[PDB]
Amino acid sequence: GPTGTGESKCPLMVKVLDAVRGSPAINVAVHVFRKAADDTWEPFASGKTSESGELHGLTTEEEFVEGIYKVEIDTKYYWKALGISPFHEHAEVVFTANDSGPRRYTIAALLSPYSYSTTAVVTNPKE
Amino acid sequence: GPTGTGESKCPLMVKVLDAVRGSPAINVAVHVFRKAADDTWEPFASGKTSESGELHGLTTEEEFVEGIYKVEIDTKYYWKALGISPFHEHAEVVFTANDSGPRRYTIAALLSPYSYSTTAVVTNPKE
Amino acid sequence: GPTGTGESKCPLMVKVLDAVRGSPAINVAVHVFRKAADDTWEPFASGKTSESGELHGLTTEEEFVEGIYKVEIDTKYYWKALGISPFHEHAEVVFTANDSGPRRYTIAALLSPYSYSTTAVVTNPKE
Amino acid sequence: GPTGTGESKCPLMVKVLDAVRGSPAINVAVHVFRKAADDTWEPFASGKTSESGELHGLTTEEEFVEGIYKVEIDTKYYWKALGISPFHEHAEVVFTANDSGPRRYTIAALLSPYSYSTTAVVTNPKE
């Protein structure tokens, strides 16, 4: 649907859960970078998790080209605002998106102070 | 809404993901038991995961009384149909539901052959 | 020797870690069970996790035969001492032991108030 | 001694486990980095995981000072040897080391084609 920037049929979605409260991790900053030609990391998109703990509308299909991306979840300020001191500075996820035709990626993350898991769920663009 | 048996505003929902394929764990058997008065386990409800890897309509609010329940995910036949031999016979989750007023429980599970994580997300009945 | 029910060779070890504090879980109660004839759970061995979070010397090679064992780790109380109300009554791991050999089974567990991940590390013994 | 860059006291250990095979991950490449002045990543230490999946003797107490270190574990290739196409380029763990002490840091990681969980076990040394 929408082309350029925005939501569209969300080709990239992020979900954060809180393993200490058993609730969605609300208002967590997410920073997406893409591997640019000079090998450095260029800012691709950014956003905060909603009440449901999800971040949609990060990019559109026409913008989400092949490449390597890194999803940075700023987990530390999340715990610090909770008064808890955490171990990691953030949690990043690096991958090759789109090198065999367009896909949908759902990057899910379970959080705890001294531990974290990440899972991706990829699907082939359906109606 | 609906009272007795069925879906309603789903007071108990289950979600299974596949950590080896990066996809929803489809058609996995889920068996829910409740701690009956004689301490044994009585069958409460059952179902299979859908295409989205979720199981809804297990019970209604009026039926989901306080108590201890065990959600059995029959992970082994899941992997065996995939030709993979797994380590656990199944994955169960035991908890005390409703001892402080009604809640909604989303039991999520990430699966792998020799490992598995489970997370619950509980919320207070909203509109 | 010591054999019977003690370290010796250790065919089964239990490791419990605390994901909120970033430390091992000391004094968690663990109760191993074996599946009996009339399909019930007969008490096998038990103990408490040490200050390093590992539980050694539960059974031995001569007594540890092929079958279905159940490792139930008592987490609720663990969290309770910590002044934390957890979601689970406990954590259990149901598996078919031995098969083609006594080998070595390590059961790992990572706990959070609302989550637990488990892993079995079955490796070949030589000493 | 050995100090400098070797076991000795081991302020930082790396543990890599394979959740698909139920075994430790042997020969995974791990590269530790330290955050430098001009906020970049200066190579610190590196090596390969042993047959038990642990990587010992990376740095030592005198050389391991307060700061931001980065443990990047090269998983993609690991899975590749296994004839499995993974989702991640690698796994990294970004953390502030030392603070109030050299202590001991254990970085645990559990891998799957589409997932990885990580945990830091920072415990008090006495030997």
Swiss-Prot record, chains A, B, C, D:
Protein residues bound to L-thyroxine: K15, E54, S117
Keyword Lyase found: no
Primary localization: secreted
Effect in UniProt of substituting E54K: In AMYLD1; early-onset amyloid polyneuropathy
Secreted keyword on record: yes
Modification type 4-carboxyglutamate: residues: E42
Protein name: Transthyretin
